[PDB]
Amino acid sequence: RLSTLIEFLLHRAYSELMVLTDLLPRKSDVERKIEIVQFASRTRQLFVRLLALVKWANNAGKVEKCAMISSFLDQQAILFVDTADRLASLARDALVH
């Protein structure tokens, strides 16, 4: 899923840069430098959060195993409650009649 997010991030970055380059000659150049460094801050934040993602990409498989563990233990808890539930449905419904 990170490939799709990487492509979409690169696309949105290139498109916003295209809009900035289109307004670059249009904008007043002195304040346009300020708008350029604001856009550079935008791109730096996008890229550093992608850097955090590709850092965590080593730690992805352990979280996959943790999700497996959590699903398994939730299943066994539902087994305990289902056993108690079916015993209650025995003791209060079928034996009374």
Partner: protein, 75 residues
């Protein structure tokens, strides 16, 4: 003699929830390690609105031409 409807109990210790599931699942050393990357990445860069828009795009999911059409003056 035998009670009514006795049967065979399952295999003595199969997979349960009473085992240590992590050490069986080879995840022990990661936990023993583990028990900001904004700060660990600000080891590389300066610091860590439109970054809210970065996170919102995260929650939502012609280079020579750009250099040629990037005409803007210095001062």
């Amino acid at each position: 003699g035998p009670f009514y409807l006795m049967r065979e109990l399952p295999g003595s210790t199969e997979l349960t929830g009473s085992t240590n599931l992590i050490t069986h699942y080879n995840l022990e050393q990661a936990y023993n390690k583990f028990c900001d990357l904004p700060g660990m990445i600000d080891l590389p860069g300066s610091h860590d609105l439109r970054s809210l828009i970065e996170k919102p795009p995260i929650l939502s999911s012609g280079t020579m031409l750009a250099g040629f059409r990037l005409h803007t003056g210095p001062l």
